From Swiss-Prot, chains A, B:
<comment type="subunit">
    <text>3CL-PRO exists as monomer and homodimer. Only the homodimer shows catalytic activity. Interacts with host FBXO22; this interaction promotes the proteasomal degradation of nsp5.</text>
</comment>
<feature type="active site" description="For 3CL-PRO activity">
    <location>
        <position position="41"/>
    </location>
</feature>
<feature type="cross-link" description="Glycyl lysine isopeptide (Lys-Gly) (interchain with G-Cter in ubiquitin)">
    <location>
        <position position="90"/>
    </location>
</feature>
<protein>
    <recommendedName>
        <fullName>3C-like proteinase nsp5</fullName>
    </recommendedName>
</protein>
<feature type="cross-link" description="Glycyl lysine isopeptide (Lys-Gly) (interchain with G-Cter in ubiquitin)">
    <location>
        <position position="5"/>
    </location>
</feature>
<feature type="active site" description="Nucleophile; for 3CL-PRO activity">
    <location>
        <position position="145"/>
    </location>
</feature>
<feature type="topological domain" description="Cytoplasmic">
    <location>
        <begin position="1"/>
        <end position="305"/>
    </location>
</feature>
<comment type="function">
    <text>Cleaves the C-terminus of replicase polyprotein at 11 sites. Recognizes substrates containing the core sequence [ILMVF]-Q-|-[SGACN]. Cleaves and inactivates human TRMT1, preventing tRNA guanine(26)-dimethylation of tRNAs. May cleave human NLRP1 in lung epithelial cells, thereby activating the NLRP1 inflammasome pathway. May cleave human GSDMD, triggering alternative GSDME-mediated epithelial cell death upon activation of the NLRP1 inflammasome, which may enhance the release interleukins 1B, 6, 16 and 18. Also able to bind an ADP-ribose-1''-phosphate (ADRP).</text>
</comment>
<feature type="domain" description="Peptidase C30">
    <location>
        <begin position="1"/>
        <end position="305"/>
    </location>
</feature>
Length: 305, 305
């Protein structure tokens, strides 16, 4: 028992991290098979950052301008191409530490682990969610660009995120591994609206089920609700609407605890309307939305990779 | 910017995890050089667990009774000794993936990463603190015993914790890697009192500095305090007394921020006496005590391994 914000074991990803240098900029790349993936903004200078012409900047670069180092060993670059906001550097050696992997574009409200890296060296691992507004609330300093987010299933790493930048609000924005930003963002040093964020309701309900499984039960009540009544409350408190597809994915947790999904919704409604009254749930004094139903089941069933 | 509960990259530890089987019990072991370390309770059966005679149980066992498996490959056990609450199995093969490592006995209030494992396979990684009462608030299910806690400094893993048991209160107890329990605990299925716990004051102060660095500064105020006045408040709220040694280790965060340690103590006083209202500090509605001053500096300075 116990419930923690748990990240995937990072070893399979640690062996893919490289340093990429172009001019004076150093950031991280991801070495899979004979390709290194990194943010295209490695090719910019401070002059460029307001609105870089990435096509013109890349035309001035040759394979030998991209310095790629995997720990102490220098890789030989034999081609380069830009795909959306990522550069793909072809190297002459396949990464012998390449795991089984997939590139995936995740949905808002899904979670993933981030391996924060500086100069191609791993610093730390943490779990976070893709917000409904396609930002992430990470921990990234100057030099962390190219750090990646991922999930692991059996022996297969699903890469879903590459870090590109910090918005002036201090939240984080990045791309899938085909270089398509999540959300409206562009790789330019400009103020950029994220637009309205919301609480991931299905995740809050999964976490309440996690709390009951761990014996934190004070918020259970004598009430029930409807999906329509609940969604009226959700809209008032800037929660995502709950759909039957959300109810369906909560089924295993409903079955385990014996608490019907709409009964757990009535508990959540009362927490939204009344607050916690200075009480905690799983060590938190607010409602936690960064655990998916899959996360809760995995942590509660002890699945390994 | 941003502040997350960050674990160390787990790859160096993942390469040391094995499965150990004695009779019908399977748990995790740690394979370093030519020794596998695991909880000695692997040799108990259900009849034994109220008060095992570990000396008599281990006498009934021979080298060939300890099945040690690293992924698919079987290790040959050529010796066995019990050291306190750990078993040490000498194997005929040095682990080729052994990192540079140390065994260290940590102090209460220190933090470490836990690699939670089942059947010798890594499940997840999280950060946590050794509580002042020598428990840990982890996430561990049946089969997680032998999971380890560690810190990394440069290329060196310092192993500080091996998981042994869940107390009836659902908090966790375990040993250093010499098999000495943290706290008063014994490897017996008995109700066992954990001391009174306290909040780790020096860590809360470190986290308030982390909050200012990240620009959450609403809790800063016009007040100051003294070490004696603060410590009268600390005792009323079951906070550890703050010592000059604590003030000294906050020195770098005081210098970085220009906020005198006793000013930061007067912010914490007001938070203890008034609560947060319904505001948050680094995404938390309570005062966080699982970041050390060292942790905050590392995360705020971007140190790698
Ligand atoms: O290291 C960089 N450099 C850019 C990328 C660059 C902008 C202008 C082209 C896109 C400015 C950035 O946003 N960060 C950063 C990221 N994450 C946390 C941080 F603290 C900084
Ligand atoms: O898997 C075991 N088995 C014992 C060890 C064993 C006690 C009685 C001899 C020492 C009973 C245990 O406490 N757990 C466990 C640990 N952590 C989280 C869990 F949910 C269970």
């Amino acid at each position: 028992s116990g419930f923690r914000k748990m990240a995937f074991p990072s070893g399979k990803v640690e062996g893919c991290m490289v340093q990429v240098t172009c001019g004076t900029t150093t950031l991280n790349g991801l070495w899979l098979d004979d390709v290194v993936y990194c943010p295209r903004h490695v090719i910019c200078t401070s002059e460029d950052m307001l609105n870089p012409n990435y096509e013109d900047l890349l035309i001035r670069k040759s394979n030998h301008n991209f310095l790629v180092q995997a720990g102490n060993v220098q890789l030989r670059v034999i081609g380069h191409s830009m795909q959306n906001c990522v550069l793909k550097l072809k190297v002459d050696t396949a990464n012998p530490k390449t795991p089984k992997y997939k590139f995936v574009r995740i949905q808002p409200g899904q979670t993933f682990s981030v391996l924060a890296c500086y100069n191609g060296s791993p610093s730390g691992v943490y779990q976070c969610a893709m917000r409904p507004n396609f930002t992430i609330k990470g921990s990234f300093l100057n030099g962390s660009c190219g750090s990646v987010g991922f999930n692991i299933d059996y022996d297969c790493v699903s890469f879903c995120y590459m870090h590109h930048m910090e918005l002036p609000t201090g939240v984080h924005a990045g791309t899938d591994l085909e270089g398509n930003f999540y959300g409206p963002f562009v790789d330019r040093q400009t103020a950029q609206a994220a637009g309205t964020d919301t609480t991931i309701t299905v995740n809050v309900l999964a976490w309440l089920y996690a709390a009951v499984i761990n014996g934190d039960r004070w918020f259970l009540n004598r009430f029930t609700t409807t999906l329509n009544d609940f969604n009226l409350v959700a809209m008032k408190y800037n929660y995502e609407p709950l759909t039957q597809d959300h109810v369906d994915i909560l089924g295993p947790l409903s079955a385990q605890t014996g608490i019907a999904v709409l009964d757990m919704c009535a508990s959540l409604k009362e927490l939204l309307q009344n607050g916690m009254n200075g009480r905690t749930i799983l060590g938190s004094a607010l409602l936690e939305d960064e655990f998916t139903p899959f996360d809760v089941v995995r942590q509660c069933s002890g699945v390994t990779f």
